[PDB]
């Protein structure tokens, strides 16, 4: 499960090899990386 997000339409997005860095719904070049369920720990202080 590959996930980015476009900064314009907020449509979640995967990006394979030999692709343009563009969104597929809109034609937007800036495209930001989402976060997944991954463990980070914090001392509640």
């Amino acid at each position: 499960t590959l996930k980015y997000i476009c900064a314009e339409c907020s449509s979640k997005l995967s990006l394979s090899r030999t692709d343009a860095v563009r969104c597929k719904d809109c034609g937007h070049r800036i495209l930001l990386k989402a976060r997944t369920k991954r463990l980070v720990q914090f001392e509640a202080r």
């Binding site: 997000i5 900064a7 339409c9 907020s10 449509s11 930001l32």
Partner: protein, 69 residues
Amino acid sequence: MIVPVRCFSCGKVVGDKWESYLNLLQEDELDEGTALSRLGLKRYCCRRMILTHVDLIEKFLRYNPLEKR
């Protein structure tokens, strides 16, 4: 940002009195003096935590990059 959990100086839990205080001023049409005294705040260290709070999370939540438009 959001209302602090505890008062800074005494340590009373104060985080449960922000949505209470806004409904005391909106619907009961109280002043800020009686609405703080109804909520059990009576030390001036602990009054100013609800009294003098900005609550800028409502302005930060307008910028949701996950939802369209």
